[PDB]
Amino acid sequence: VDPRLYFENRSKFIQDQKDKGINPYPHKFERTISIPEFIEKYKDLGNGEHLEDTILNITGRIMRVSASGQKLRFFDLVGDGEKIQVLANYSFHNHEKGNFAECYDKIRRGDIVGIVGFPGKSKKGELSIFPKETILLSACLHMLPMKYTEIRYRQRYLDLLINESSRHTFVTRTKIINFLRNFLNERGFFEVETPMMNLIAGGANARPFITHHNDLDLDLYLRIATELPLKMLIVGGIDKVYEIGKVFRNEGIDNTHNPEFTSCEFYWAYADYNDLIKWSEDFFSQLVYHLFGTYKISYNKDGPENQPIEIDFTPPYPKVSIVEEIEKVTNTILEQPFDSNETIEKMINIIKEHKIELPNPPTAAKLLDQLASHFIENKYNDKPFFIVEHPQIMSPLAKYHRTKPGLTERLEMFICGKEVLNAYTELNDPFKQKECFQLDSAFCTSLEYGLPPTGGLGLGIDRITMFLTNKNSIKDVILFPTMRPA
């Protein structure tokens, strides 16, 4: 009951075993089968049917202890997120390697044990290892919480050990990244690594982290996006390139925002806005079908206490032009240029009339993003959708819209009001790029060397995982989300 008492007395137990000549952290256990392999091998067994001739070395963590008397011990053995029973029987025990009561009265919950024993099914039909000998491989000194907070995030091993849904969540995350990596690779894409720190932070609009490099003696910027070096690789003839990796934005932490998060950015030469749209639809529909066998998934947008909303990932997804729909909903045209004093003040007026929060700073791109957020981002929640054709001031690195002046060929896919995908036709015309004289002289010079018509796309893998694992917080899909020390 007292945690310090349980920990201190189990440490005392460790030293008691050591003083007793038994190493509680033995050097090695020659495991022969994993718990999933055990379950797959011996699932087709009748109740009460042993396989006594088959001597297996299996390992796992003890998660339950019970007794039908001092002579019969029941345990729960977990390994790789799968469970079998442990049916210690005084008869099947090797009494020449230890006392049965001694060898099993010491086992507590959380204990990593190695078991020499045979497979079978109990009279209750439970798949079990019947141990002839059981070796504690690693003592869990602390008391393992039953199902109990910030702890899940800090000591993530506890969260993975007690909550099966947590391991399911992270297995889904890796399955998502595997599916995306495989998807791109099947489409001829080439996975690369670009620097995590650069002399600038370009690709998006966010505060960068600053870190000091000693041997170069300079303050480098943790990359906010992989956009620029990837487009440089497109210049370098890798026409189908991508990168899955962490990007850092030194901004606010909330349930959908982490300072560091897993982006996937691909750049696909000779691909236009429709190629990016079709890619987004194909990718999300195929990934959701892969992960669920259906295109419709449930998601607790308003938390687990409220009824979930069904998100239909059936393509095509609707595309909505931001400025057209802002002018429609707000019944005011945003005159170009969108950062003219008139247009800036007009957007501020629309925001003020609607009691929508004015963003810091009230730049026309930020005001446009706030207008989109309020008026169009939270109005398709049954399916994902694209907000498209953003003003060029919102996306300096996007190619100009062919037929709509001042707009771009940008697509940004939202799921339940959250931006999971940002894509557009890359601006390949160096003269048409402002800030070519943050911005890179290296990137602008690469543009001057010829960037082919490219389509770029970026995926917030953490957010996508949030939606496909039914998690409301991004801290629930990152194994060790950055937390405040206590």
Ligand X SMILES: COc1ccc(Nc2ncnc(Nc3ccccc3S(=O)(=O)C(C)C)n2)c(OC)c1
Ligand Y SMILES: N[C@@H](CCCC[NH3+])C(=O)O
List the interface residues with a second copy, window 282-311 (CB under 8 A): none
CB of 130 to ligand X, least distance (A): 42
Query: Which one of ligand X, a second copy, ligand Y, none interacts with residue 158, CB within 5 to 8 A by kind?
Result: a second copy
The reply to whether 463 sits near ligand X by the rule CB under 6 A is yes
**Residue 111 interacting entry, from ligand Y, a second copy, ligand X, none, C-beta within 5 to 8 Å by type:** a second copy
Residues 340-369 that bind a second copy (CB under 8 A): none
Residues 442-461 that bind ligand Y (CB under 6 A): 456-458
Out of ligand Y, a second copy, ligand X, none, what residue 384 binds, judged by CB under 5 to 8 A for its kind, is none
Q: Is 239 in the site for a second copy (CB under 8 A)?
A: yes
* 365, interface contact from ligand X, a second copy, ligand Y, none, CB < 5-8 Å by kind: none
Which range binds ligand X by CB under 6 A, 230-238, 333-341, 434-442, 455-463? 455-463
Residues 211-230 that bind ligand Y (CB under 6 A): 225, 227
What does 374 bind: a second copy, ligand X, ligand Y, none (CB cut-off 5 to 8 Å by kind)? none
Q: Mapped to the 3 state alphabet, what secondary structure does the chain carry?
A: CCHHHHHHHHHHHHHHHHHCCCCCCCCCCCCCECHHHHHHHHCCCCCCCECCCCCEEEEEEEEEEEECCCCEEEEEEEECCEEEEEEEECCCCCCCCCCHHHHHHCCCCCCEEEEEEEEEECCCCCEEEEEEEEEEEECCCCCCCCCCCHHHHHCHHHHHHHCHHHHHHHHHHHHHHHHHHHHHHHCCCEECCCCCEECCCCCCCCCCCEEEECCCCEEEEECCCCHHHHHHHHHCCCCEEEEEEEEECCCCCECCECCEEEEEEEEEECCCHHHHHHHHHHHHHHHHHHHHCCCEEEECCCCCCCCCEEEECCCCCCEEEHHHHHHHHHCCCCCCCCCCHHHHHHHHHHHHHCCCCCCCCCCHHHHHHHHHHHHCCCCCCCCCEEEECCECCCCCCECECCCCCCEECCEEEEECCEEEEEEEEECCCHHHCCCCCCCCHHHHHHHHCCCCCEEEEEEEHHHHHHHHCCCCCHHHCCCCCCCCCC
- Select 60 or 203, whichever has its Cβ closest to ligand Y: 203
Q: Which of 116, 161, 320, 347 binds a second copy (CB under 8 A)?
A: 161
456 touches, from ligand Y, a second copy, ligand X, none (C-beta below 5 to 8 Å by class): ligand Y
Q: Which stretch binds ligand X (CB under 6 A): 159-167, 192-200, 302-310, 413-421?
A: 413-421
Residues 397-426 touching a second copy, rule: CB under 8 A, are 399-400, 402, 409, 425
Residue 229 or 458: the one with the smaller Cβ distance to ligand Y is 458
Which of ligand X, a second copy, ligand Y, none does 222 bind, CB closer than 5 to 8 A by kind?
a second copy
For ligand X, the binding residue among 367, 462, 465, 468 (CB under 6 A) is 462
Among positions 112-141, residues that touch a second copy (CB under 8 A) are 112, 114, 137-141
The rounded distance, in Å, linking the Cα atoms of 106 and 23 is 13
Q: Of these, 204, 291, 344, 439, which contacts ligand Y (CB under 6 A)? A: 204
Of ligand X, a second copy, ligand Y, none, which one sits near residue 45, judging by CB under 5 to 8 A according to partner kind?
A: none
The stretch among 241-249, 283-291, 301-309, 359-367 that binds a second copy (CB under 8 A) is: 241-249
The answer to whether residue 246 forms part of the interface with ligand X (CB under 6 A) is no
Token duo for residue 24: 């509680």
Q: Which is nearer to ligand X, 17 or 205 (CB)?
A: 205
* Cβ distance to ligand X smaller for residue 65 or 206: 206
Tokens of 360: 């810091």
Number of residues that bind a second copy (CB under 8 A): 118
End-to-end CA distance of the chain: 23
Among 4, 186, 214, 306, binds a second copy (CB under 8 A): 214
Q: For residues 201-240, which are near ligand X according to CB under 6 A? A: 206
459 binds ligand X (CB under 6 A): yes
Question: For residue 210, what are the β-bridge partners?
Answer: 221
Q: Is the dihedral of CA 45, 46, 47, 48 positive or negative?
A: negative
Q: Are 127 and 52 in contact (CB under 8 A)?
A: no
CA distance 260 to 250: 8
248 lies in the binding site for ligand Y (CB under 6 A): no
Q: Smallest Cα–Cα separation from 97: which of 55, 54, 131, 59?
A: 131
Interaction of residue 11 with a second copy, rule CB under 8 A = yes
- Tokens representing 102 are 């001694």
Residue 79 to residues 34, 38, 58: CA-CA distances in angstroms? 7, 10, 9
CB of 474 to ligand X, least distance (A): 6
Size of interface with ligand X, in residues (CB under 6 A): 21
Which residues bind to ligand Y, rule: CB under 6 A?
Answer: 203-204, 225, 227, 263, 265, 422-424, 426, 456-458
Which residues bind to ligand X, rule: CB under 6 A?
Answer: 206, 249, 251-253, 256-259, 261, 263, 419-422, 458-460, 462-463, 474
